[PDB]
Every structure is written in C-alpha cells, then in structure tokens.
Amino acid sequence: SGTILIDLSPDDKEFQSVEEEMQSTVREHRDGGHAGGIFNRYNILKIQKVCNKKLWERYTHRRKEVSEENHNHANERMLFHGSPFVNAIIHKGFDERHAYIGGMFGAGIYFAENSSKSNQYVYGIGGGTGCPVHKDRSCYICHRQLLFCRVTLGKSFLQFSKMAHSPPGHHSVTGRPSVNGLALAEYVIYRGEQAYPEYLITYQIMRPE
Ligand SMILES: CCOc1ccc(-c2nnc([C@H]3C[C@H](NC(=O)c4ccnc5cccnc45)C3)n2-c2ccccc2)nc1
Ligand SMILES: [Zn+2]
C-alpha cells in the first residue's frame, strides 16, 4: 500500500486547525437535513495525517504541470471530500475512472469548502439510504469519515448547474451559487492526481440540544 496514518493528539495545533475548519464551515442546508442529517456541530473523534510517498509525488508532479499552464499559480485549496470510498482513496489515491456521471458538473471528483456539504455524500449521492446499520441519513450513532484534501484547481472554470474533462485551457470547474441551482460553492477535478487526501477525519454529527 505505502500509506501510513499518523494519529494527531487533540492538543496538537495541526489537529486543532483541521477541527476548527470542520466545525466553522458547517451551514444550514436548504434540504432541512434530508441528505446529511440535522446538526450544527460534530463530535470530532480522530484526525489522522495520511502519509503516502507515491501519492504525494503523483500530486506534486501534476501540480508543477498545472502551475506552468496557469502563470506559475497552482490555485491550491484545502477542501473537504465526502464519499463511501474514503478507505480506497487513502490507499490508492483519487480515481476519476470511479466518478459518478449524475453530478451537476459531470464525471469528476467533487470537493467543498463547507464540511457539512461533503458530509451529505459520505453514504452516497444525496446521502444514499443512510448509515449501513440503521439506514438513517441523520444517524448520531455510526461514525463517519471525511477527507480534508489538498486540491490543485489551476485555472478554474466558473459555472452554474453533462461534462467529461475540464473545459479547454482549464484545470477544474468551480460551481457557484444560483437561485435555481447550487446553494454553496463546489469544486470539481477530472484527474485524480489533482488532489491529495491529506487528513482523514473520523466524527459523528452531534444531536443538537
Ligand atoms: C449531486 C452531488 O454529486 C456528487 C457529489 C460527490 C461526488 C463525488 N466526487 N467524488 C466522488 C468519489 C471519489 C471517486 N472514487 C475514487 O476516487 C475511488 C478511488 C479508488 N478506488 C475507488 C473504488 C471505488 C470507488 N471509488 C474509488 C468517487 N464522488 C462520489 C460521492 C458519493 C458517491 C459516489 C461518488 N460525485 C457527485
Ligand atoms: Zn447508524
């Protein structure tokens, strides 16, 4: 595999930065919690740094290329990723060949700047049938995993809510909010090597009250 997970102590400022980013970027969703559950906060159980030399080199190699194509600017962002495939991704890396064709921006890998948006996909598109054990999308019991990832957007194409690759001259798509469309920003890459899954976050959504 080559992948090592480093457990971060809650007293570690690197843990605390990821924890804060996760808690602070929660929003109320217009679906009233249908996809990700009803919560305003998480129980952060565990944050692990993902260390894989092969995957890191794959990422930085792509990043150099994107940079030369975008006026020496990678347009690198730290973004949340949610999917059922977290375990595969930390071992084998992101893989566009596994992309689901039912996305707003076609067959790509979707990231978000709001943790609560990525949380809606941990059990599948629109939350699937919820947690495996209780078939509940708002399950407070079962533990979830998000990735907090290093993502190379390069020259990002701006769009509102049928697409295979980046537009010509572009490296990603930035989905922007619209009245008849997106509520929140999402980012899409069409090459797996434009993201590194840097931190694996184990959490529950917290029951409010
Ligand atoms: C309307 C919202 O649309 C979305 C939201 C998120 C995503 C998305 N963006 N990226 C993803 C996943 C990351 C991709 N998979 C891998 O990189 C992958 C990597 C390595 N092995 C695998 C084995 C099985 C499946 N996937 C893999 C698919 N997905 C995804 C999420 C939930 C279910 C299915 C796909 N796709 C569409
Ligand atoms: Zn459950």
Side-chain angles (χ1 to χ4, degrees), residues 1-52 54-161 163-179 181-209:
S1 163
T3 292
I4 284 166
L5 300 174
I6 309 133
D7 205 36
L8 295 193
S9 176
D11 310 322
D12 188 337
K13 296 230 143 50
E14 187 165 8
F15 180 110
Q16 288 179 164
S17 170
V18 177
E19 174 184 32
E20 180 52 21
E21 199 57 40
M22 182 89 167
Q23 305 278 22
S24 63
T25 62
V26 174
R27 296 295 167 261
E28 302 205 49
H29 297 266
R30 61 142 99 75
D31 83 348
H34 176 84
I38 300 150
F39 66 91
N40 43 69
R41 225 186 82 79
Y42 309 104
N43 200 22
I44 308 298
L45 297 178
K46 192 135 104 147
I47 308 179
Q48 297 167 279
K49 191 105 162 224
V50 181
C51 170
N52 186 306
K54 189 199 289 285
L55 292 183
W56 182 252
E57 285 174 353
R58 180 176 178 246
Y59 175 75
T60 63
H61 174 92
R62 179 54 179 156
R63 189 178 61 188
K64 196 213 177 158
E65 282 173 341
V66 170
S67 224
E68 293 185 351
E69 275 161 38
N70 189 49
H71 296 97
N72 180 47
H73 180 239
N75 189 12
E76 188 172 84
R77 291 283 304 284
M78 293 307 288
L79 300 166
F80 294 103
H81 172 85
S83 66
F85 313 118
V86 149
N87 193 65
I89 292 159
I90 64 169
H91 291 295
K92 292 183 292 139
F94 290 100
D95 191 334
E96 71 284 348
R97 296 175 289 187
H98 281 284
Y100 281 56
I101 298 103
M104 312 83 153
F105 302 115
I109 319 288
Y110 290 66
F111 300 87
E113 69 191 354
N114 299 291
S115 65
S116 60
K117 175 154 173 182
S118 304
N119 176 66
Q120 300 183 310
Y121 311 131
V122 299
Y123 293 132
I125 303 297
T129 59
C131 67
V133 167
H134 316 93
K135 289 191 177 69
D136 176 6
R137 284 187 286 274
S138 188
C139 188
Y140 300 113
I141 292 151
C142 302
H143 299 173
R144 307 177 183 209
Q145 297 184 314
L146 280 192
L147 298 174
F148 189 51
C149 304
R150 197 180 286 258
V151 182
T152 294
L153 297 177
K155 195 178 186 214
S156 208
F157 186 80
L158 304 189
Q159 219 181 119
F160 303 118
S161 2
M163 175 149 267
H165 316 287
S166 300
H170 291 79
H171 302 106
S172 61
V173 172
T174 300
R176 282 295 195 64
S178 159
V179 167
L182 257 38
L184 294 172
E186 60 191 43
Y187 311 81
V188 192
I189 63 179
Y190 300 91
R191 290 148 97 92
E193 65 271 13
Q194 280 183 219
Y196 184 75
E198 195 162 353
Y199 299 102
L200 172 63
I201 304 157
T202 308
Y203 70 105
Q204 301 149 292
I205 54 164
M206 196 76 86
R207 193 171 42 94
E209 265 139 314

